[PDB]
Write an enzyme that holds these catalytic residues in place. Structure first.
Site, PDB file in Angstrom:
ATOM      1  N   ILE A  56       7.037  -4.753   4.325  1.00 24.14           N
ATOM      2  CA  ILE A  56       6.989  -4.097   5.704  1.00 24.14           C
ATOM      3  C   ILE A  56       5.862  -4.817   6.670  1.00 24.14           C
ATOM      4  O   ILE A  56       5.188  -5.412   6.492  1.00 24.14           O
ATOM      5  CB  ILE A  56       6.524  -2.637   5.368  1.00 24.14           C
ATOM      6  CG1 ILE A  56       6.590  -1.712   6.674  1.00 24.14           C
ATOM      7  CG2 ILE A  56       4.935  -2.483   4.954  1.00 24.14           C
ATOM      8  CD1 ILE A  56       8.131  -1.535   7.093  1.00 24.14           C
ATOM      9  N   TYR A  82       8.039   2.260   8.001  1.00 25.53           N
ATOM     10  CA  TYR A  82       9.368   2.754   7.474  1.00 25.53           C
ATOM     11  C   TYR A  82       9.955   3.776   8.906  1.00 25.53           C
ATOM     12  O   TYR A  82      11.162   3.834   9.038  1.00 25.53           O
ATOM     13  CB  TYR A  82       9.550   3.545   6.414  1.00 25.53           C
ATOM     14  CG  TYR A  82       9.316   2.517   5.249  1.00 25.53           C
ATOM     15  CD1 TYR A  82      10.168   1.367   4.852  1.00 25.53           C
ATOM     16  CD2 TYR A  82       8.183   2.546   4.475  1.00 25.53           C
ATOM     17  CE1 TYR A  82       9.781   0.619   3.983  1.00 25.53           C
ATOM     18  CE2 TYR A  82       7.970   1.632   3.186  1.00 25.53           C
ATOM     19  CZ  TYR A  82       8.788   0.724   2.980  1.00 25.53           C
ATOM     20  OH  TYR A  82       8.599  -0.141   1.911  1.00 25.53           O
ATOM     21  N   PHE A  99      -3.561   1.322   3.620  1.00 21.12           N
ATOM     22  CA  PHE A  99      -3.805   0.561   2.516  1.00 21.12           C
ATOM     23  C   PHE A  99      -4.929  -0.077   2.161  1.00 21.12           C
ATOM     24  O   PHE A  99      -5.596  -0.544   3.212  1.00 21.12           O
ATOM     25  CB  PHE A  99      -2.698  -0.639   2.824  1.00 21.12           C
ATOM     26  CG  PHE A  99      -1.025  -0.271   3.115  1.00 21.12           C
ATOM     27  CD1 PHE A  99      -0.609   0.036   4.369  1.00 21.12           C
ATOM     28  CD2 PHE A  99      -0.508  -0.290   1.896  1.00 21.12           C
ATOM     29  CE1 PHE A  99       0.504   0.464   4.455  1.00 21.12           C
ATOM     30  CE2 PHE A  99       0.969  -0.133   1.856  1.00 21.12           C
ATOM     31  CZ  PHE A  99       1.543   0.634   3.229  1.00 21.12           C
TER      32      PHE A  99
END
Lengths: 107, 128, 903
Positions: A56, A82, A99
């Site tokens: 991503i 996304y 993250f």
């Protein structure tokens, strides 16, 4: 749109350049605080080939800024994530991701 | 045998309470005297449960039962059946001599496995 | 909807036995400072991130039970509003993390300096990382209780405490006015590192189940004597005003004569040759008549306590003489005993207790006076800083000083007794120090319900380590966790503290134990009998019965059970190892009995009673409270009415009742930037939700509170009011002040119903029902309240991602109490459109069955984990300080309920 906060600084002089794969242990969490993905549970480093856009976009261009041995927290917007289509049965549509990336080594 | 002869003699039972009623044996202090020393209606006149011979036998019973091995349990009920079958002490002794082979198995019962180890853990226990 | 799962690490906490707090006329300083040193921190011993936080916590609600809890488990400092922790990057409070700017911010690395500064006079909690300031301070937090240093850590860490003096060097200069934390230790207790309130500790022969721990209180630091001013001095006392003073003018001087402190005519008292046994006329007049009126003051204390005098026997003046001993001989104006002499006189225990509390009331007046001159307590004496090691209340003083105070006044009361005047004890009034928290007193332990036995004969031991109020026996599986054992039919328990057997009441049985005793409980399901044996001897009832309980039905079966009162230790041996038992050979082995865990591999799982309030649905069989779901008519919204079943009848239950709805509402992720017919375009876009509560007539608005609660509210108080609401304000600014972020965190957001009632002279039973309305806006985090269609000045703003449960706290004062109306105002969506995802565009009110009222249980069951973290606490050195070590990793599998936000 990405925000990176250092959790524990590493080296700060060796930055991920094109040509060498990046080896990380990340821990992705939804914005509500519910963990959805991690690599330490699978107990295997996630080696991704930087520059070829197989991961991503948010993760890819957030991994570039942080250096070797650095534990960094990201915040990927749905535009660099996304987005509206989302991930089927994993990530809800139009969600912001966090993250806990650590690049333990470059190869 | 003192208890056995008491059980056999119905007359010795009959004047067992006669002495109690004539001499006003309370039968309650003789059991709790030590308990009251530690600063702790129905059968007031006399009751079989408060008889001193049966109480003494019950209190002394665990000492005798320690002398029996765990394997002897199967032999206990068989002798109990013969005693109910009105068999003398010589009869039960020779019946036990006939069926000595059917003693308990330590491996066949998990209860006997820990019991055997506990029983043999006594320093006063000899294997022979 | 579906329950989530994860693997998390066990998190434990360690604190030093240091307690501080603020109170009106308290003997405690209001500024403190401590530090911690990081030795080793493994970033990832397991998959989960290593946990390490340092902060302050409060003694009345920070009880981090191991295992699950709030959020995703592993709770420590900052996971609740009773702690305030710092981790190197975040301020943790109410399970919320907020980033802090630091000069080189990072997680706690090895060899990092963390300094915690606490101010009690004004609420402020300041941190320093490596000396550099941390731009964030907790403020406006409740001070009730006691504040203490605490560290919450996962496995694989080593840290050190720095408390100042001999227990830390601090490696830095603390800000002025902050006393080093080594000075807060009480005289009776040594400095040590302890875990927070526990239910288990390891022992020699096995684990030791521990009951509740007695906790010191701020109220125990205020010296509260009996006032000795409004006392007219009696004639019989002024008649003896002199001798009782003459005998205490040099009584302290008598001990040291004929020693190195032997008097001389050139000098006087306080000159290292103090005595001056001659008389008080030679001594200065002000302290002289001061000593007279101090003797009078002691007699006034005797009056206020309840002591009165009466003369019967021969006057001691005749049969008393002064003894010119060879010792205490002096050259200055003849020799005599320094106090007035006395012959053989004795004292009864009533006089001993009375002189004890007389010395108590002397000490507490002295301490009160010193505090009124500004002084405070410190374990090391500092005269220019005006601190003393004896400025604690008498009950907290040391035995040496207790005896030293009691000796003088014991001599005084002895001299009074010699003259034959009676020392009359006052009346006796039994009092309890703490009464409100009746539930934080016992802790029940029992085996798991899967170990239920319905046949055979079973045996287990219970080694009573202490001799307090503990109970042991057998119980049925459905035992209520918030009922004392033996008070009902669900337990056959033996309270051997006084030798009683408990089942539906109390009656004596056997003898009370002593320390080191073993209570080996029998059970015989075939004979329906329960026998309790103490130290291998069968206990005897107050009759000829040798069996404690007889004619017991098998029922569901029985579980080995025990409980412990405050400050108790018990060793429960279920007999997993037959050899480990002690009195089994003496009693039980020959009777055909078996150990309860004779053939078992893993240790028997035990469920303890957790004293943490939780929200559970109202039982349909509840005798007192009932909740009625009312169908929504054409003109009225659907209702959730509460009605007291037994209001006004005999044996009615009336108490502070906490209610919340089952499903919460969550605020939006990102806040927005900067007739009676609803407008269709406004209604399909608005993010405002309303509900109305109708307090019935006859129910007092003075005991009504309406609003919202976060899922971590666990405040079960019978005297609830808005003051007790936990709140804290986080203050953030740049490097040099300049506050740019000030938020308020609370687990409780309601108003008081007494602010919505007109101040009528009488007739508080309102003829019109108070209809409190509440509104929320998810796109702004703003909530409001409406009284009777008119707004109220109180308002609330909350952070995003906040879960709030509609709540009503009420004390019942009528048969009909509360009614939740799921209504709607003009251009406002209902709650059924707020908490259900598939109803976001439906303005019609609905009451689906999952929406139901819940009320706060005080106590609930829980499971004891099969393994615990191995923490090594010790003193590393005089310069190093105190070290904490943890190596072994332990992982648990947590089950997280989404809507309740607890696992």
């Amino acid at each position: 749109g990405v925000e990176i906060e250092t959790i524990s600084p590493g080296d700060g002089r060796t930055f991920p350049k094109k040509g060498q794969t990046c080896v990380v242990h990340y821990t992705g969490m939804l914005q509500n605080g519910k963990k959805f993905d991690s690599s330490r549970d699978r107990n295997k480093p996630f080696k991704f080939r930087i520059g070829k856009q197989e991961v991503i976009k948010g993760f890819e261009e957030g991994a570039a800024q942080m250096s070797l041995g650095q534990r960094a927290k990201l915040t990927c917007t749905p535009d660099v994530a996304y987005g509206a289509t989302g991930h089927p049965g994993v990530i809800p549509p139009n969600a912001t991701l966090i993250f806990d990336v650590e690049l333990l080594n470059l190869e | 045998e003192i208890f056995i002869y008491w059980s056999k003699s119905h007359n010795f039972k009959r004047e067992e309470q006669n002495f109690v009623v004539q001499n006003e044996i309370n039968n309650m202090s003789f059991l709790t005297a030590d308990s009251k020393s530690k600063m702790a209606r129905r059968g007031d006149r006399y009751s079989v449960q408060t008889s001193l011979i049966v109480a003494t036998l019950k209190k002394m019973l665990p000492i005798g039962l320690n002398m029996c091995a765990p394997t002897d349990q199967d032999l206990i009920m068989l002798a109990k059946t013969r005693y109910a079958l009105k068999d003398t002490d010589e009869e039960v002794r020779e019946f036990l001599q006939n069926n000595l082979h059917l003693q308990g198995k330590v491996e066949g019962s998990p209860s006997l496995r820990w019991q055997m180890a506990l029983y043999r853990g006594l320093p006063g226990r000899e294997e022979d | 909807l579906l329950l989530q799962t994860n693997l998390i690490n066990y998190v434990t906490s360690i604190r030093p036995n240091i307690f501080v707090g603020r109170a009106e006329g308290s003997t405690q300083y209001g500024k403190w400072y401590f530090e911690v040193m990081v030795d080793e921190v493994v970033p990832f011993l397991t998959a989960q991130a290593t946990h390490l936080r340092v902060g302050w916590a409060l003694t009345e609600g920070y009880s981090p039970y191991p295992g699950g809890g709030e959020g995703w488990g592993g709770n420590g400092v900052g996971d609740d509003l009773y702690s305030y922790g710092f981790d190197g990057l975040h301020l943790w409070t109410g399970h919320v993390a907020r980033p802090v700017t630091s000069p080189g911010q990072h997680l706690l690395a090895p060899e990092d300096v963390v300094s915690c500064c606490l101010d009690l006079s004004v609420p402020s909690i300041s941190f320093r990382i490596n000396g550099c300031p941390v731009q964030g301070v907790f403020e406006a937090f409740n001070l009730d209780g006691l504040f203490f240093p605490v560290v919450s850590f996962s496995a694989g860490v080593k840290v050190r405490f720095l408390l100042g003096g001999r227990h830390g060097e601090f490696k830095f200069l603390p800000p002025p006015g902050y006393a080093p934390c080594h000075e807060a230790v009480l005289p009776r207790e040594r400095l040590r590192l302890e875990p927070i309130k526990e239910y288990r500790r390891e022992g020699p022969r096995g684990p030791h189940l521990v009951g509740p721990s007695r906790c010191l209180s701020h109220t125990d630091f205020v010296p509260c004597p009996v006032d000795t001013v409004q006392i007219v001095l009696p004639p019989h006392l002024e008649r003896i005003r002199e001798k009782l003073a003459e005998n205490i003018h040099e009584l302290w001087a008598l001990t040291r004569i004929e020693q190195g402190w032997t008097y001389g005519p050139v000098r006087d008292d306080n000159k290292r040759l103090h005595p001056c046994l001659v008389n008080f006329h030679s001594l200065p007049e002000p302290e002289r008549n001061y000593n007279l009126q101090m003797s009078g003051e002691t007699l006034k204390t005797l009056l206020a306590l309840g002591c009165h005098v009466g003369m019967a026997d021969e006057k001691a003046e005749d049969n008393l003489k002064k003894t010119k001993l060879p010792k205490t001989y002096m050259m200055s104006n003849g020799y005599k005993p320094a106090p007035l002499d006395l012959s053989h006189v004795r004292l009864t225990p009533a006089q001993t207790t009375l002189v004890d509390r007389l010395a108590e009331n002397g000490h507490n007046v002295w301490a009160r006076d010193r505090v009124a001159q500004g002084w405070s307590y410190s374990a090391v004496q500092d005269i220019p800083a005006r601190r003393n090691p004896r400025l604690v209340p008498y009950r907290l003083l040391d035995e040496a000083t207790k005896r030293s105070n009691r000796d003088s006044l014991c001599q005084a009361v002895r001299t009074l007794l010699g003259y034959g005047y009676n020392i009359e004890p006052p009346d006796q009034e039994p009092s309890q120090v703490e009464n409100q928290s009746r539930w934080d007193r016992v802790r029940i332990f029992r085996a798991e319900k899967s170990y239920t036995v319905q046949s055979g004969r079973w045996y287990f031991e219970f080694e009573a380590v202490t001799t307090g109020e503990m109970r042991v026996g057998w119980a049925r599986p459905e035992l209520r966790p918030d009922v004392e054992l033996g008070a009902d039919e669900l337990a056959y328990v033996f309270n051997g503290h006084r030798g009683q057997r408990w089942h539906l009441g109390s009656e004596p049985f056997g003898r009370p134990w002593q320390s080191g005793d073993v209570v080996g409980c029998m059970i015989d399901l075939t004979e329906n009998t329960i026998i309790f044996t103490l130290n291998g001897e069968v206990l005897m009832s107050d009759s000829g019965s040798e069996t404690a309980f007889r004619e017991i039905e098998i029922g569901d079966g029985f579980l080995p059970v025990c409980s412990l009162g405050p400050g108790q230790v018990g060793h429960l041996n279920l007999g997993q190892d037959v050899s480990s038992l002690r009195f089994f050979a003496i009693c039980g082995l020959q009777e055909g009995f078996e150990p309860f865990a004779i053939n078992m591999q893993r240790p028997v799982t035990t469920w303890f009673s957790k004293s943490l309030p939780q929200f559970e649905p109202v039982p349909p069989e509840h005798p007192h409270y009932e909740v009625a779901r009312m169908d929504g008519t054409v003109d009225t919204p659907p209702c959730l009415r509460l009605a007291h079943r037994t209001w006004g009848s005999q044996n009615s239950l009336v108490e502070m009742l906490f209610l919340r709805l089952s499903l919460p509402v969550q605020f939006h992720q990102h806040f927005r930037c900067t007739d009676n017919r609803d407008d269709p375009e406004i209604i399909l876009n608005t993010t405002t939700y309303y509900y109305s509560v109708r307090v019935f007539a006859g129910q007092e608005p003075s005991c009504v509170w309406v609003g919202w609660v976060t899922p971590d509210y666990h405040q079960h108080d019978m005297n609830f009011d808005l003051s007790k609401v936990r709140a804290v304000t986080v203050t953030m600014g740049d490097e040099q002040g300049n506050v740019h972020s000030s938020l308020k965190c609370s687990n409780c957001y309601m108003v008081w119903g007494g602010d919505f009632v007109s101040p009528g002279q009488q007739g508080r039973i309102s003829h019109t029902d108070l209809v409190i309305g509440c509104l929320v806006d998810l796109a702004t985090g703003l909530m409001t309240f409406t009284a009777n269609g008119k707004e109220s000045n109180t308002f609330f703003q909350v952070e995003p991602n906040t879960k709030l449960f509609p709540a009503v706290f009420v004390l019942p004062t009528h048969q009909n109490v509360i009614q939740f109306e799921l209504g709607k105002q003009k251009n406002i969506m209902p709650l059924s459109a707020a908490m259900f995802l598939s109803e976001r565009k439906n303005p019609a009110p609905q009451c689906p069955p999952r929406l139901e009222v819940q009320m706060l249980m005080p106590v609930s069951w829980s499971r004891m984990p099969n393994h615990f973290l191995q923490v090594e606490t010790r003193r590393a050195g005089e310069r190093l300080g105190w070290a904490v070590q943890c190596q072994d990793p332990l992982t648990m599998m947590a089950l997280h309920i989404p809507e309740e936000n607890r696992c």
